[PDB]
Paper text:
The trimeric spike protein is a major membrane surface glycoprotein of SARS-CoV-2 that mediates the binding to the host receptor ACE2 and subsequent viral entry into cells. The matured spike protein contains two subunits: an ACE2-binding S1 subunit and a membrane-fusion S2 subunit. Extensive structures of the spike trimer reveal the open and closed conformations for the three RBDs within the spike trimer, where the open “up” RBD conformation is prerequisite for ACE2 binding. Upon ACE2 binding, the spike trimer undergoes conformational changes to expose the FP motif of the S2 subunit to initiate membrane fusion that allows the release of the viral genome into host cells.
To reveal the molecular basis for the high affinity binding of the Omicron BA.2 and BA.1 spike trimer to mouse ACE2, we determined their complex structures. The high affinity binding of mACE2 to both BA.2 and BA.1 spike trimers can be rationalized with the extensive interactions between mACE2 and the RBDs from both Omicron strains. Particularly, Q493R forms three hydrogen bonds with N31 and Q34, and a salt bridge with E35 of mACE2; Q498R forms a salt bridge with D38, and a hydrogen bond with Q42 of mACE2; while N501Y forms extensive π-π stacking interactions with H353 of mACE2. The interactions of the RBDs from both Omicron strains with mACE2 cannot be completely satisfied in the hypothetical model of the WT RBD-mACE2 complex, which are consistent with our binding assays that the WT RBD cannot bind to mACE2. Collectively, our results indicate that the three mutations of Q493R, Q498R, and N501Y in the Omicron RBDs are essential for mACE2 binding. We determined the structures of spike trimers from both BA.1 and BA.2 in complex with mouse ACE2, and our structures elucidated that the three residue mutations Q493R, Q498R, and N501Y are essential for mACE2 binding, suggesting their importance in infections.
Numbering used by the authors:
A (entry chain D): 19 to 134, 140 to 615
B (entry chain A): 335 to 528
């Protein structure tokens, strides 16, 4: 219990300096993003270098304190987050090679091009993979992108994997996959501990219950593609990867125009009625603030309205035009978005306002603890608000939809099908990719069996088959942005689970008496107080307690997810009764 | 009349760690002019009420002016605890006077940061009521001597306020003015108008 006031004073001084340094760095980054110039770029780089140097110097000293001797929970947590060095564990030459390989792979990815026609990735090729409906048109693109990017990235990934493994081993971790799993690790009492090795068991058990719904969605989509790809779809086989409406099959949203349940009754789009009423940029954020106040959350500060860039500047300034909630610190919250008069823009503004509210929640916690419980709670806190705002009753009350509008059963089915294609479709992909990456880092898949096991998993778990045989020279995983660039991918699965968990938890607090997908938490102070009970904690307490504060449970549970798509589940069960549920893994298009 | 124009309308207020003090001896006072600006989130009176200030007469009044964060203004009160209450400015548990403060973002804030205001971050012990410490020696936190060089377990006590125009709303500068109505078995001089 000795030598604790020293660590307390160290944390106090560290916070005092880091708050100002982070404010400076965030302001520089904001000035750069809102005004792209070489001067702003140099200022941002200098600020980032200063902040990195300060943080690294303070972390090197943080390791001097033996954490096991500290007894105060909050001080122990503050020390634990700062003691983790990470990349600094490697030597000079090891970091040399690691950064070289990483940035070279990033440049090979961004600067990738396919030549039979010649279209870049973001323009042209993605538009093809999204809208194109011809077999060869998509096949040649899907083959060329890989043969051009993954074949060049393969020799670099074989070294990057071992480099990251060496980096993790220096940090007392087993492998790099185990290092990423540390984000969900939790410490506390007996009823709040969460072993790092238990994440795989939860991910597997949670996926075992989603297979039926995903299997039915796959059986339904497969038949609906036979009308457009007759000789390229099998009645009992897997789906071709290039026919998933995406370069990698991550999102099936592009398949909605073809797999629509009912074509004679489309979805809702209040863009026309929104523009006719004179809804400008700020009008949307005003409605978002009103909604967030109806649940009992704080109001928006005048500083936010004054500093935020809620409209594309006509002064010719270059902007990255990407939605992002900014928390510059010291109460300086801002939103950066080229707001337009549309419904997608409305939902994104709601999501960013939810992010800002979340950031405002835990502002009372120490600087080192001003972060979400985990990488899944952040996006979910905004996704739940976006869902609550998409209810037809909410749009009718706001004045966009006429009060005479009566919701129909077919429109709800179409909306749920689109959501599943955009939500349920990516759940198996993320799990498969994360499991493959873990097995690679752990050394369970030798370098001579990367693509073989990758495609076997694609066929078994995801039910996707390749159009042409790929040998060990190809690297399909690296063809994805999140694989080339070092970014954890399991965050999306946990986010998809936690968003539905919170939606089902707050609906009970709001005393709803209807379907979950039509739940509107608006005008329910009890719902916000229960949610704010967790947003204020942030990273102060283990994520288990944060989840218990809202959902009541201490771990992931996919039952709310299945409850959300329960109508779509029964609809698919009634429709997929016209086919064989499942898919075979021994069938392939290249079996000519 | 009393020189209230010098306490509030000063072109530059003192730091919380070096709060200045001014006293009244002879002339008449007037409390109805303490209206620096419309929103006065800080008009807390202790031991007295604002409506009877004119009728009551005191021997002398001490006015302490200093700037602190908006979040720290609540710490200026009898019996409160905090970095400002313990290490910068402590009020007695039974204090009679008036605490006045107002926003000063337009004046004491700059885009590049106004590092002219400072505060004491660490101190070996809490300050006594109405105590003012302006030392600058290093704060020894461990079992090693502070040899005048800052470093691990040897931190500088004073830190700077980086007031900015967009510095939120709680961290913005607030010009505080604490009026202590000292009264004793002495000739009363600070009376109200007649
Ligand atoms: C946007 O970028 C421009 C690039 O020129 C910035 O302009 C310079 O700003 C410095 C400091 O503001 C001035 O001393 C120079 O004279 C400026 N050049 C011009 C063209 O005036 C500009 O400040 C940045 N603007 C915004 C709005 O962030
Ligand atoms: C929310 O509350 C306001 C005020 O009572 C009311 O006008 C509006 O109809 C309510 N809307 C919802 C979503 O129930
Ligand atoms: C400071 O001068 C202004 C006039 O510019 C006056 O209104 C204000 O009351 C003065 N300050 C005080 C509290 O005496
Ligand atoms: Zn985002």
């Amino acid at each position: 219990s000795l030598t604790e006031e020293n660590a307390k004073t160290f944390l106090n001084n560290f916070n005092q300096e880091a708050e100002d340094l982070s404010y400076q760095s965030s302001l520089a980054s904001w000035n750069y993003n809102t005004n792209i110039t070489e001067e702003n770029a140099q200022k941002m780089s200098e600020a980032a270098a200063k902040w990195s140097a300060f943080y690294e110097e303070q972390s090197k000293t943080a390791q001097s304190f033996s954490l096991q001797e500290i007894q105060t929970p909050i001080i122990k947590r503050q020390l634990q987050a700062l003691q983790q060095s990470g990349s600094s564990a490697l030597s000079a030459d090891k970091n040399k090679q690691l950064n070289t390989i990483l940035n070279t792979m990033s440049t090979i990815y961004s600067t990738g091009k396919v030549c039979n026609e010649c279209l870049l990735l973001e323009p042209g090729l993605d538009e093809i993979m999204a809208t194109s409906t011809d077999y060869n048109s998509r096949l040649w693109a899907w083959e060329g992108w890989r043969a051009e990017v993954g074949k060049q990235l393969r020799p670099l990934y074989e070294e990057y994997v071992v480099l990251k493994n060496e980096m993790a081993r220096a940090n007392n971790y087993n492998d790099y996959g185990d290092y990423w799993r540390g984000d969900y690790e939790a410490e506390g009492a007996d009823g709040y501990n969460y072993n790092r090795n238990q994440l795989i068991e939860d991910v597997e058990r949670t996926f075992a219950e989603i297979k039926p719904l995903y299997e039915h969605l796959h059986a339904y989509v497969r038949r609906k593609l036979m009308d457009t790809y007759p000789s390229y779809i099998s009645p009992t086989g897997c789906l071709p990867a290039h026919l998933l409406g995406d370069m990698w099959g991550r999102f099936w949203t592009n398949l909605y125009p073809l797999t629509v349940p009912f074509a004679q009754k489309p979805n809702i789009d209040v863009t026309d009625a929104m523009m006719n009423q004179g809804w400008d940029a700020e009008r949307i954020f005003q409605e978002a603030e009103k909604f967030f106040v109806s649940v009992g959350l704080p109001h928006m500060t005048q500083g936010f309205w004054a500093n935020s860039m809620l409209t594309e500047p006509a002064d010719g300034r270059k902007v990255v035009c990407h939605p992002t909630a900014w928390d510059l610190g010291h109460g300086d919250f801002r939103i950066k978005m080229c707001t337009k008069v549309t419904m997608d823009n409305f939902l994104t503004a709601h999501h960013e306002m939810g992010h800002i509210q979340y950031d405002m929640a835990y502002a009372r916690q120490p600087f080192l603890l001003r972060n979400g419980a985990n990488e899944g709670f952040h996006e979910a806190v905004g996704e739940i608000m976006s869902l609550s705002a998409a209810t037809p009753k909410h749009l009718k009350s706001i004045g966009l939809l006429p009060s005479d509008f009566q919701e129909d059963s077919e429109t709800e089915i179409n909306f749920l099908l689109k959501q599943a294609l955009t939500i349920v479709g990516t759940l198996p992909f993320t799990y498969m990719l994360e499991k493959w990456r873990w097995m690679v880092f752990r050394g369970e898949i030798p370098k001579e069996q990367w693509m073989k096991k990758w495609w076997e998993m694609k066929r078994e778990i995801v039910g996707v088959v390749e159009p042409l045989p790929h040998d060990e020279t190809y690297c399909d995983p690296a063809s994805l942005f999140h694989v080339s660039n070092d970014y954890s991918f399991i965050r999306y699965y946990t986010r998809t689970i936690y968003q539905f968990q919170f939606q089902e938890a707050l609906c009970q607090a709001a005393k709803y008496n209807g379907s979950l997908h039509k739940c509107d938490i608006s005008n329910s102070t009890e719902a916000g107080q229960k949610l704010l009970k967790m947003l204020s904690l942030g990273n102060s307490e283990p994520w288990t307690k944060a989840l218990e504060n809202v959902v009541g449970a201490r771990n992931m549970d996919v039952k709310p997810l299945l409850n959300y798509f329960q109508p779509l589940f029964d609809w698919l069960k009634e429709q997929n009764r016209n086919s064989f549920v499942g898919w075979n893994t021994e069938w392939s298009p290249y079996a000519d | 009349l009393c020189p209230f124009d010098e306490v509030f309308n000063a072109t530059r207020f003192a730091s919380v760690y070096a709060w200045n003090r001014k006293r009244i001896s002879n002339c008449v006072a007037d409390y109805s002019v303490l209206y620096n600006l419309a929103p006065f989130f800080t008009f807390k009176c202790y031991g007295v009420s604002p409506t009877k200030l004119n009728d009551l007469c005191f021997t002398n009044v001490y006015a302490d002016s200093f700037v602190i964060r908006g979040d720290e203004v609540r710490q200026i009160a009898p019996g409160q605890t905090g970095n400002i209450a313990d290490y910068n400015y402590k009020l007695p548990d039974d204090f009679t006077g008036c605490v006045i403060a107002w926003n000063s973002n337009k004046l004491d804030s700059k885009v590049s940061g106004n590092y002219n205001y400072l505060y004491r971050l660490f101190r070996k012990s809490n300050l006594k009521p109405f105590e003012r410490d302006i030392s600058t020696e290093i704060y020894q936190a461990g079992n090693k001597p502070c040899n005048g060089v800052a470093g691990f377990n040897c931190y500088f006590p004073l830190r700077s306020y980086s007031f900015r125009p967009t510095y939120g709303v709680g961290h913005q500068p607030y010009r505080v003015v604490v009026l202590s109505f000292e009264l004793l078995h002495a000739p009363a001089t600070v009376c109200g108008p007649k």
